[PDB]
Amino acid sequence: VLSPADKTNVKAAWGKVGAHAGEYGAEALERMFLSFPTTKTYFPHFDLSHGSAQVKGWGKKVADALTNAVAHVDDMPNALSALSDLHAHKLRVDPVNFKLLSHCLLVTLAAHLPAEFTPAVHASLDKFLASVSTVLTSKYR
């Protein structure tokens, strides 16, 4: 579970991210596509080039969903329910990929949070993204 310290750490880190959240979501997708090319199988309709507006648009929506999850950290399953449905029954992204995106989100946050990304905050963010991932895959079967 997410402890109160985890929740505090996540809110502080995401609060520092602030208005850059959409940018960081896009950067995380780019990192994922370059690092883990199999993930490109889900985006054959995107221009994957650096600066792509499709990547930017996805990054914004993903960021806004994470912002909503952080705001609703005690009630994440309901906050993310429409996205759990979308991923389970339409997009059908293999659950193994959520660990890949989560790692790339962590790497992006690390690269942008010199002061905030302490070992404790890193641990909390890893648990938070694993929890979001669990929620998003909870309706797959």
């Binding site: 090319p37 199999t38 993930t39 199988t41 293999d94 193994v96 990929n97 079967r141």
Partner: protein, 146 residues
């Protein structure tokens, strides 16, 4: 990868008892039932509404035959799985957009099907040999992804 001679012999011996069309249909159907997100490639295949509809679906059975027929032919090339599957690898990446995790899931299901079909004959050492094979095939089909 890395079968011993006796493991190769064990794989070949068991496979000579396999009805490829039947096991292929059963393995693909079970994949779509046990891991239903794998249905994402098969929206054009008609009725997938229940486990019985999936297992009975003629297009699911036909695709299972096709997939396991290529798997079967590949067993003749256990020392060159990458070469044998390279052109199918490029296809699955460039045109079909199949996440190679699907190959691993199908491997899991195939092993469960062989266990179900062969019972006690599917011994722990035989399973270990088949695990090497399904890992090797999945790695080969994934190798030309980019």
């Amino acid at each position: 990868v890395h079968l011993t001679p006796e493991e190769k012999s064990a794989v070949t011996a068991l496979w000579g008892k396999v009805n490829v069309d039947e096991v292929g249909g059963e393995a693909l159907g079970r994949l779509l039932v046990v891991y239903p997100w794998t249905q994402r490639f098969f929206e054009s295949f008609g009725d997938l509404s229940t486990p019985d509809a999936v297992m009975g679906n003629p297009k699911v059975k036909a695709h299972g035959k096709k997939v396991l027929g290529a798997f079967s032919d590949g067993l003749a090339h256990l020392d060159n799985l990458k070469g044998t599957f390279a052109t199918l690898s490029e296809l699955h990446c460039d045109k079909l957009h199949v996440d190679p995790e699907n190959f691993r899931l199908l491997g899991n299901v195939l092993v469960c099907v062989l266990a179900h079909h062969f019972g006690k004959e599917f011994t722990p050492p035989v399973q270990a040999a088949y695990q090497k094979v399904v890992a090797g095939v999945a790695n080969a089909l994934a190798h030309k992804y980019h």
